[PDB]
Amino acid sequence: SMFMHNQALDRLMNPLVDQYLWYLDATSGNNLTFRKAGAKNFPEYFRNWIPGPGCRNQQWNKVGTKNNPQTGTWASANKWRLQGRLNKYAPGQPNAPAEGFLTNAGDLAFANAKATGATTAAGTVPADILLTSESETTTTNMMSNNGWGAIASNNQNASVAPTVQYEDSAHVLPGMVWQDRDIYLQGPIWAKIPETDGHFHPSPL
Amino acid sequence: SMFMHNQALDRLMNPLVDQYLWYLDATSGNNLTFRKAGAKNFPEYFRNWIPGPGCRNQQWNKVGTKNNPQTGTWASANKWRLQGRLNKYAPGQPNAPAEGFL
Amino acid sequence: DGVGQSSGNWHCDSVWMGDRVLTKSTRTWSLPTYNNHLYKQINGSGTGDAVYFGYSTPWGYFDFNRFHCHFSPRDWQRLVNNHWGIRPRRLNFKLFNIQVKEVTTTDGTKTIANNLTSTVQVFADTEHQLPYILGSAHEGCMPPFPADVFMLPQYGYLTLNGPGSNNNNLSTPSSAFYCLEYFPSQMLRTGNNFVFTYEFEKVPFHSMFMHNQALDRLMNPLVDQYLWYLDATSGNNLTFRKAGAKNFPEYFRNWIPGPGCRNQQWNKVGTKNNPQTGTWASANKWRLQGRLNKYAPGQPNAPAEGFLTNAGDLAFANAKATGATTAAGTVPADILLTSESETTTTNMMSNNGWGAIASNNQNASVAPTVQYEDSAHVLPGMVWQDRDIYLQGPIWAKIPETDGHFHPSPLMGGFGLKNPPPQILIKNTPVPADPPTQFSSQKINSFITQYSTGQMTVEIEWELRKENSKRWNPEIQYTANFNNSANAQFSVNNNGLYIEDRTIGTRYLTHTL
Amino acid sequence: DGVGQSSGNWHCDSVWMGDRVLTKSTRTWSLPTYNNHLYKQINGSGTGDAVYFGYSTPWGYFDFNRFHCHFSPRDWQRLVNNHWGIRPRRLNFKLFNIQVKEV
Amino acid sequence: DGVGQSSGNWHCDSVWMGDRVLTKSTRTWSLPTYNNHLYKQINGSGTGDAVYFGYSTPWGYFDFNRFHCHFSPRDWQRLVNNHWGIRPRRLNFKLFNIQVKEVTTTDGTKTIANNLTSTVQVFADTEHQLPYILGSAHEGCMPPFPADVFMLPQYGYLTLNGPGSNNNNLSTPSSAFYCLEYFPSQMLRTGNNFVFTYEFEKVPFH
């Protein structure tokens, strides 16, 4: 798909008419109060689809003065392990970072012919390094700068308050949509799907 | 599908005959003790299939006197966020609540 | 035809022709009369995790499901060393040489006679309208060894229960009651015989190969990648490193290891383990309708070397083990363990979590941290192996009809089927005793005690995948043990008891990843 | 034919096709010998509202008359909720697998 | 066919025609149930010249091998005085008039009845895939004299043994176990009968 989306998921609707669906807004007063979804309050609407999977990833500001001075990023990277040995998890699902931030091997990066050797350094992202950005996908895919959402922490009664906890990672659920990572001019065209008894959405990361 | 199921997952089996599969029930006594799955103990059986996905959701009793007096339920809702802004997660996967709750 | 002439012949053999293999097997079975020709509901007591409501039935059923019914240990060796895959195609079922016998007890002695005019009645359920109890790995299958004679198991099912006051065993308005005489069965005297055929729908081959490479190890070691990453933040400036020069963890990869979850690991040495009088408290569990169930077996996640799990992988036993339990300082000699360690190249191991993840946002004054993920689930671009099929394991299972299912393969291993082989159900037709002369409208209480016996056969056409591999050096293959033993392996002992010495998986030959 | 081969098979089911429904049922029956193979007259005593004269017979008779012989409680539910009327048309009767035993 | 009619007739004779002679013989045999329908391994004890490892089988076998099964002492005299050589050519084998009987013991007495629906199952091994115990000059052949009734011998074989510590009777990884039900035999009630034919390859005259 060469196209960037024209709408966000949460923004798919007709703004001019309210939904016919009802929810419980307010418990106060020893009685239940049902509110009707509509009148330009978007977070409350019912929706058929939910944003794609992902996980958090440590974010490194492009300005060098604001970053924390680590002599290596291996300790802080997202990792997966196989046969008792740990491997950097790169690149993840196409989860865009915050504006003005980047990640450790979260997205592809290239270099000029001017860069020879194993390293380059500059006060900001070097002029030889060619960054890529998935920010075109933020309309569907999850961003990397925070978790996927909240969830109910505990059961309630009259004497205990309801609480919620935050989900840092997500996985595939029914009725969920996402974009695959983009192909660049300098990127690889294909890959071989390893022959295995199962694979899910077999597109190269 | 217009039908309601006739059986639970965990309840799919023949109750009259025990399985031929063995598991480790008891470690005590400095030796390993393997038990044979069967004799009407259902939780122990091996099964081919497992129940569907979901997540917890805050439950509100239909009786109004037992509920906690919140002037809004937005703070306690299940939410997913997109482009830095949070959205109620509704409706979730078809996960039934407790009887007498919503 | 008639009483004098036989209705069939004995076929047990195997025929290897090209890419097809055709197995035939026959056994001799014995069918009693269950429940005195009655249907009975069965139910538990009180509240708890095990509570049930169901019906026991005066019927019995043939189960050939398990593998080694269809294969001898030589045919299995011959199969798993030479081939990369197998799937079923057709099957053919027959009953013949039915004979029904009646029992009479005078004083304390039994005298068995032979009733020529009695019948048995049998049917197969093609449309799967009854509850399907196969694929649940029960007992009562064809024995491994052709000279054993076995007794058919009783048929029964159980259904929805409901929340009574102190009792969850109370039936629910939707609890179903199936009468098996409301099926159009077939009644068979001694002369006539029963047959039907079946055809499997297309399924993928089961992979008989172990992988030749790990995921993280797929690459050319001699040339570095062209991709760049941020190695070092120090010095108030960003430093990009180029992936390569024999540092593997840093490489970019297209694929990631499969899903799973941690599972408590129990050392095979008994002295090192913690003395728990039961493992139920420590097991991985999933819960349904408010009651908890052990989660077994999980996804094929191998444990550490020298460790095992609680119902994480399949386990079997000899014919020497009778009763519900065995114990030894180490894993008992009767217990037959299975191991998924062949899958560690893709699937996740059970001894630790799936990986780490970013804990927090950073700034100059706060250090970056990470947290560990104990469980994982399905993500795009992720690969795994399914659990292996053994010689003693189940062949198939029925995919429950539902609005959705993901990668529908049985967690015990097998071939998931939308339309599995039909259940086969059989009963002794009730013959009443002498009625009274004065009419009475009540049911007939007393019958003539009798049982039946005969022979069966199962002929399955298997499809299998040729092996073309150009690897120079030789491969691991299944071979008999090299010690001189008191009893030859997979053979009878002095007392005449057949013994499987160990389980055999199908994965020996390798394949590139 | 012969002693060795069966004379019939078990049919119990129901078939709903259009505006016809076709029910099949089978049972197993047991017949004694009544009256020691004799006919006997039977009669009451005295005068009253119940007084009778008749004959008891060394015979026995199949009676399928009642409804639920022919319908299961699900087939009945399925019948009475969906339809405004029913009438019979044809019937077919069979006996098979006779076997006689002496005491 | 059926229980009422016989499946064969009695043929015992000899026919001398030119340079061919054709012998027919029939006997009446009795087959028990060996090993309670079980396979059992059998083995010796200790070290010595006689040590063995094998299997006893719940089967039985017809052996006609020996000569005088096929020749009467007059036919033999008539043969050896008039001729310079003999070799076999073809053979024809048949079983018929099978009848199976069941035994019941009440107190200490036996009562033998006749089970019409029971079967026996028989096969011939054409490809010689089982261990071949004939030609070893055992007992259990057809008797010399046609009016004798004999009992069929039990089938069994023995296989490689191996050097355990004090025991050479210990099985070896290559010791073979043959299950005879893994052969496609033929099941016979009382009415039906069994037959096959065979043809010798050319051998020199004796």
The beta strands (E) that lie in C75-130 are given as: 85-106, 109-115, 120-124
For C173-178, the CB contacts below 8 A with 24+ separation are C174/B4, C174/B6, C175/C53, C176/B6, C177/C55, C178/C55, C178/C130, C178/C131
Please return the burial class of C336, using the count of CB atoms within 10 Å of its CB with bins 0-12, 13-18 and 19+. buried
CB contact under 8 A, A162 and B58: yes
CB contact under 8 A, C133 and B46: no
Nearest to C281 by CA among B27, B48, B46: B27
Q: How many helices (H) and strands (E) does chain B have?
A: 0, 4
For D28-37, the CB contacts below 8 A with 24+ separation are D28/C429, D28/C430, D28/C432, D29/D62, D30/C432, D30/C435, D30/C444, D31/C435, D31/D60, D32/C434, D32/C435, D32/C436, D32/C437, D32/D60, D33/C437, D33/D58, D34/C437, D34/D58, D34/D59, D34/D60
Nearest Cβ partner of C147 from E39, E173, E184? E39
Nearest to A112 by CA among A126, A125, A129: A129
Q: Write down which chains contact chain A via at least 3 CB pairs under 8 A.
A: B, C
Longest pairwise C-alpha distance within chain C: 110
- List, as one string, the DSSP characters of C20-86: EEEEEEEEEEEE--GGGG--EEEE--SSSS---EEEEEEEEEEB--BGGGT--HHHHHHHHHH-SEE
- As a whole number of angstroms, the distance between CA E55 and CA E161 comes to 12
Query: How many CA atoms lie within 13 Å of A57's alpha carbon, on the beta-carbon side?
Result: 31
Q: Confirm if A136 and A4 have CB atoms less than 8 A apart.
A: yes
| Dihedral, A131, A137, A142, A143 alpha carbons, nearest 10 | 40
Q: Confirm if C164 and C175 have CB atoms less than 8 A apart.
A: no
The DSSP secondary-structure symbol of B45 reads S
Closest residue in chain C to residue D12, using alpha carbons only: C182
Nearest Cβ partner of A197 from C356, C362, C385? C385
> Would you state the structure tokens that stand for residue A146, as one six-digit string?
């925070």
- As a whole number of angstroms, the distance between CA C362 and CA A66 comes to 9
Nearest to C159 by CA among B86, B11, E50, A126: B11
* Whole-number Cα distances in Å, C493 to A178, C20, C27, C318, C499: 62, 34, 21, 13, 8
Grouping H, G, I as helix, E, B as strand and the rest as coil, residue E115 is strand
- List, as one string, the DSSP characters of D8-36: -----EEEEETTEEEEE---------GGG
SS (H, E, C) C443-507: CCCCECCEEEEEEEEEEEEEEEECCCCCCCCCCCCCCCCCCCECCCCCEECCCCCEECCCCCECC
- As a whole number of angstroms, the distance between CA B77 and CA B60 comes to 11
**Cα–chain center distance at E57:** 13
Contacts of C283 (CB under 8 A, 6+ apart): C264, C294, C295, C296, C310, C311
Contacts of E85 (CB under 8 A, 6+ apart): E205, E206
Amino acid letter, residue C309: T
Residues of B in contact with A164 (CB under 8 A): 58, 75-79
Residues of B in contact with C331 (CB under 8 A): 32, 34
- As a whole number of angstroms, the distance between CA C45 and CA C170 comes to 9
- As a whole number of angstroms, the distance between CA E117 and CA E120 comes to 10
Which method, experimentally, gave rise to this model? Answer: cryo-EM
Residues of C in contact with D32 (CB under 8 A): 434-437
SS (H, E, C) chain A: CCCCCCCCCCCCCCCCCCCCCEEEEECCCCCCEEEECCCCCCCCCCCCCECCCCECCCEEECCCCCCCCCCCCCCCCCEEEECCEEEECCCCCCCCCCCCEEECCCCCEEECCCCCCCEEEECCCCCCEEECCCHHHCCCCCCCCCCCEEEECCCCECCECCCEEEECECCCCCCECCCCCCCCCCCCCCCCCCCCCEEECCCCC
To the nearest whole Å, the CA of C5 is away from the closest chain A CA by 51
Amino acid letter, residue C334: D
> Would you state the structure tokens that stand for residue A186, as one six-digit string?
């300098």
Amino acid letter, residue C124: A
- The CA radius of gyration of chain E, in Å to the nearest whole number, is 21
- As a whole number of angstroms, the distance between CA A143 and CA A136 comes to 11
The end-to-end CA distance of chain E, in Å, is 43
What are the φ and ψ backbone dihedral angles of D78, each rounded to 5 degrees?
-60, -30
Closest residue in chain D to residue C5, using alpha carbons only: D4
- As a whole number of angstroms, the distance between CA C29 and CA C72 comes to 20
Longest pairwise C-alpha distance within chain A: 72
* Whole-number Cα distances in Å, B65 to A159, B60, B62, B74, B97: 11, 11, 9, 20, 19
- As a whole number of angstroms, the distance between CA A141 and CA A138 comes to 5
Other beta carbons less than 10 A from residue C397's beta carbon = 27
Contacts of C299 (CB under 8 A, 6+ apart): C258, C259, C260, C261, C347, C348, C384, C387, C411
For A182-191, the CB contacts below 8 A with 24+ separation are A182/A94, A182/A132, A182/A134, A182/A136, A182/A137, A184/A108, A184/A110, A184/A132, A186/A110, A186/A130, A187/A108, A191/C254
Nearest to C268 by CA among B36, B29, B24, B32: B32
- As a whole number of angstroms, the distance between CA D39 and CA D37 comes to 7
Query: How many CA atoms lie within 13 Å of B34's alpha carbon, on the beta-carbon side?
Result: 28
- As a whole number of angstroms, the distance between CA E182 and CA C365 comes to 78
